Amino acid sequence: MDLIQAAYFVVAILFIVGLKRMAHPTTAKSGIVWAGWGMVLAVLATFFWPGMGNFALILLALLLGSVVAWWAAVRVAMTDMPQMVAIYNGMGGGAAATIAAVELLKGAFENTGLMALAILGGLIGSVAFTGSLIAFAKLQGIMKSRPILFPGQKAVNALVLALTVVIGLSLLWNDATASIVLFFLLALLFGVLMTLPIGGGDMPVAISFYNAFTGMAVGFEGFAVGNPALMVAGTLVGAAGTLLTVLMARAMNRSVWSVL
Amino acid sequence: MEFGFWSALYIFVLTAFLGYELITRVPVILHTPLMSGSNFIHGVVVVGAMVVLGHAETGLEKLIGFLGVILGAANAAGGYAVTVRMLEM
Numbered sequence: 001m002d003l004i005q006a007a008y009f010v011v012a013i014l015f016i017v018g019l020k021r022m023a024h025p026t027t028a029k030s031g032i033v034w035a036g037w038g039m040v041l042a043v044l045a046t047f048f049w050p051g052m053g054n055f056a057l058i059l060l061a062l063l064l065g066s067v068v069a070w071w072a073a074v075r076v077a078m079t080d081m082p083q084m085v086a087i088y089n090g091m092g093g094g095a096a097a098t099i100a101a102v103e104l105l106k107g108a109f110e111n112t113g114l115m116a117l118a119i120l121g122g123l124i125g126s127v128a129f130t131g132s133l134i135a136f137a138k139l140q141g142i143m144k145s146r147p148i149l150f151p152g153q154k155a156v157n158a159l160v161l162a163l164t165v166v167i168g169l170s171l172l173w174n175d176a177t178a179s180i181v182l183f184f185l186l187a188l189l190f191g192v193l194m195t196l197p198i199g200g201g202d203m204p205v206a207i208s209f210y211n212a213f214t215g216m217a218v219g220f221e222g223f224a225v226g227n228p229a230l231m232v233a234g235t236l237v238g239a240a241g242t243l244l245t246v247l248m249a250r251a252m253n254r255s256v257w258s259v260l
Numbered sequence: 261m262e263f264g265f266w267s268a269l270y271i272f273v274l275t276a277f278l279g280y281e282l283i284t285r286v287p288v289i290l291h292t293p294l295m296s297g298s299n300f301i302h303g304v305v306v307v308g309a310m311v312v313l314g315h316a317e318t319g320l321e322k323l324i325g326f327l328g329v330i331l332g333a334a335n336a337a338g339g340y341a342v343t344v345r346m347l348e349m
Contacts, residue, residue, distance in 0.1 A: 001309075003265075005261070011304075014276065015301050015304075018297070018301070019282055019297065019298065019301065020282050020311070021291055022293070022294055022297045022347075023282050023283065023286055023290070023294065024286075024290075025287065025289070025290060025349070026311065028290065028293065028347055028349070029344075029347045029348075031297055031347070032291075032300065032340065032343045032344050032347060034298065035300060035340075036340060038301075038304075039300075039304065039336050039340065040270055042263055042304055042307050043306065043307065043310075043336075046307045046310055046311065049310070051312050051314075051315070052310075052311070052314030052315070053314055053315070053316075054287075054313050054314050054316060054322065054325070055314070057313065057322065057325075057326055058310055058313055058314060058329060060326075061313070061326050061329035061330050061333065062306075062310075062329060062333050063333075064330055064333075065306075065329065065330035065331065065332065065334040066333040066334065066337035067335025068334065069333065069334035069335075069337040069338035069341075070337045070338065070340075070341050071346070072338060073337075073338050073340075073341030073342050074341060074345075078292065078345070081292070081296070081345070081346060082292075084338065084342050085292075085295065085296050085299055085342060087338070088299060088300075088303070088334060088335050088338035088339050088342070089299050089335070090337070091289065091331040091332070091334040091335045092299070092302045092303060092305055092331070092332075092335035092339075093307055093331075094307075094327075094328060094331040095305035095306065095307055095308070095328045095331040095332040095335055097292060097308060097328070098312070098324050098325065098327055098328025098331065099305070099308050099309055099312050099328065101324055102312045102316060102321050102324055102325055102328075103312065105318075105320065105324075106317070107322065113265075147307060179324075183277070197325075204295075205297065208295050211295060211298060211299050211302075211331065214299075214302050215298065215302050217302075218302045218304065218305050218308070219272070221305070221308055222308065222318065223263075223272065225269055225311070226261040226262070226263060227307070227308055227311070228261065228263075229304050229307050229308075230304065230305065230307070230308045231263075231271060231272070231275075232266070232271070232275050233301050233302065233304045234302065234304075235272055235275045235276055235279065236275050236278065236279040236301070237279065237298045237299075237301050237302045238276070238279065239275070239276040239277070239278070239279025239280045240279040240280065240282055240283045240298050241279075241295075241298055242280070242281045242293060243279075243280050243284070243289065243297070244283050244286075244295060247283070247286070247291065248291050248295075251288055251291070
């Protein structure tokens, strides 16, 4: 029994109710406020993490990220919400990957299952990372898009995915830096690759998909490192994100797979 | 933090059911704000990144720790702002 545990315990409940309240119109505006408290409490509680160096740089990072992000949110017009969501989601993904990357580079994983979850988180985040950045650029005009097809893409994609998974699993015996660089480059490549064939109107669904993905990404890292705030909220959002992705596809007459 | 394999497996599955169920009956009008709100909640990665950075020994480690804390923070902060705006309905 300790206080960061207590802190995260409340944090969970706070995320669960928030989401649930966001679930119904009559309670919705109520929702994020509830979540906001979770967010705050989780951030502030973790400053106490024992033996935590680099306090200066933590703060610079928090500040650069939050305020440009926050600023971008208010300055931007109301029809650019979708790419706004994409991009923040993107970051969420990357955030996931960095956890995975640093924890592997240190090498010290004394459990192969834990290590697998690290890697799995790693894979999914990066895919969402670049996936969501291509999402943004597409709706945003800077990549301007309708489905970027070419005759045998289905195979090269699945092949790249295959390779990624191979180099990935390789880390579990032999975790050499060369491999670690390769893994991420290949994942990052797949997020890009797998997004390309996706048309303009479909994007919402894709975003929900990659949202569900980042959710799982965060959860995996959580189980892996041993962090209850990640575990719960990650898996809460992966699940909800999954069902929600379905419902949006099924609302456009389309079917997810039709979308990808 | 010690969680046993089984304790974690139960935690994983239970929250997965919960997550799914909360979204069952949700009006069309609420999809995307809800998609935005969940997007926000994963921003809790930032906490995961912070703990990584604070434990980073080598210069390489420090550098990709810094980077992800930005990504984390943008996710929560940008998450929060957009969802509040979207919740003007």
